Amino acid sequence: EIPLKYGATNEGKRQDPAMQKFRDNRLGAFIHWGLYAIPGGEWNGKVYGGAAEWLKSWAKVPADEWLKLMDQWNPTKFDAKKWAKMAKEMGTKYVKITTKHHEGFCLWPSKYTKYTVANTPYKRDILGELVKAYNDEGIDVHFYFSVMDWSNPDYRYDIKSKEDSIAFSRFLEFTDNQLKELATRYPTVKDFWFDGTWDASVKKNGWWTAHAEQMLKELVPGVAINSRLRADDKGKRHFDSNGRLMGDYESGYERRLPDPVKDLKVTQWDWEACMTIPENQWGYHKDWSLSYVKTPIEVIDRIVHAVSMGGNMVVNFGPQADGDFRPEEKAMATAIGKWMNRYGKAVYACDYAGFEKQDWGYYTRGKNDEVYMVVFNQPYSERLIVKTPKGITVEKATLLTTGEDITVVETTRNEYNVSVPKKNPGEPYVIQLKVRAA
Ligand SMILES: COc1ccc([C@@H]2N[C@@H](C)[C@@H](O)[C@H]2O)cc1
């Protein structure tokens, strides 16, 4: 048992109302919007296949020159109420917003740097307007923040000297000032999601990560903080050197979700996956033909998969420079919202059901012991196998959308065949089980 000043703070899941709301939300959207939306992955006639929000790096653009993009920041089609409506229709319960990405351009009028929205033709506090607009739709708002900041010369990747070390303290101070500003200007914020905390400079200053979490929790009651912020005394990140989760929930599973058979350990803590629609574009990139683009059913599968394992899923959007959304993204949000509007009773406020995974899809459990079968792979057998845990029996099955009764047959001791519906629903669909325990 290694002793640590800056390791894990929670032991187990938070059960306060604010974390319960975080959890019960389940479905969110991510907004990556920044100066990178203007060049859209293209610099001086070259289209880069890398993530558009890292274009500064790929095209080796100097900061002075990258930040001059502020002169072009004027999203005349931007309308916060329209964004909030789109989110509401999609069925999202929260939105995570890049307040500042690695480039260091702030979407709120920070007084601690001139690289902000206030110094652009558009002038307006984009972040403030989104906060209000989402909140008026009853949508929670979470703040992405990049500690790594390519706009501030005090930033260091490592500390190799007194001069580094001095510069970096000033950088941490600046960072604290920005975070305080965010927390006080936008007091309805429910979460800070840190990024760009993997450099040796940050790993060598875990104390700062614990301080940042504490400071923010003091300023914003109930706020959630992600694991990626956090490094312990030994520089170990996400989980401390005793294997205990730091922050309030695990943030990962960006490429791959936990395996539904081998990774059941995740059910023991809150966690949240965030995904891109293309393979790896978060900011707006003009050419989506460069990588595979997920269809709505692929995305819905991922959303349900996360909830079936006690996790939230967040779907990313990279708005256009003009302040509108590209057609693929509007289509995606609409598809998802139609599906959520028929089947969201099996997503919202649901969790791990404790049933052995089957090939036809996923189980989720409702707040009142409902067990939902979410079918993504329709068996030619027309039989959906359900293997119950010891002492559990299935008393009824019902098609969620129509209420029709669905036949359940016991095949052996802890096992049933739940028939598919009389008419193929033609999309992923839900059957609700009434189950009874000894
Ligand atoms: C493997 O290196 C990285 C570094 C930064 C990222 C950033 N985290 C995502 C959520 C976006 O903000 C992306 O640019 C992704 C991968």
Q: The CATH number of the domain where 375 resides is what?
A: 2.60.40.1180
321 and 395 in a common domain: no
Task: Give the number of C-alpha atoms closer than 13 A to the C-alpha of residue 277, restricted to the C-beta side.
Answer: 27
CA distance 333 to 88: 10
Q: Which atom of ligand 1 lies closest to the CA of 274? A: 10
How many separate helices (H) and strands (E) can be counted in the chain?
A: 10, 18
157 and 112 in a common domain: yes
Q: Which atom of ligand 1 lies closest to the CA of 146? A: 12
C-alpha separations of 410 from 275, 355, 399, 415 in Å: 39, 16, 19, 6
- The reply to whether ligand 1 has any atom less than 6 angstroms from the CB of 194 is no
89 and 39 in a common domain: yes
Burial class (CB in 10 A: 0-12, 13-18, 19+), 244: middle
377 and 259 in a common domain: no
40 and 183 in a common domain: yes
The label of the residue with tokens 């033909």 reads 289
Question: What burial letters (b/e) apply to 146-168, b meaning 16+ CB within 10 Å?
Answer: bbbbbbbebbbeebeeeebeebb
Residue of minimum CA distance from atom 14 in ligand 1: 53
Nearest to 360 by CA among 383, 376, 381: 376
Q: Which atom of ligand 1 lies closest to the CA of 316? A: 10
273 and 419 in a common domain: no
| Angle, helices 296-308/327-343, rounded to nearest 10 degrees | 50
151 and 17 in a common domain: yes
194 and 77 in a common domain: yes
Please choose from 54, 226, 254 the residue to mutate so as to test ligand 1's pocket, defined by most ligand atoms within 8 A of CB: 54
Assign 45 to helix, strand or coil.
coil
Q: What is the DSSP letter of 238?
A: S
Provide the experimental method for this PDB entry. X-ray
Print the domain residue range for 27.
1-348+438-438
Backbone φ and ψ for 413, nearest 5 degrees, come out as -40, -65
- The reply to whether ligand 1 has any atom less than 6 angstroms from the CB of 314 is no
187: which residues sit within 8 A by CB, 6+ positions away?
220
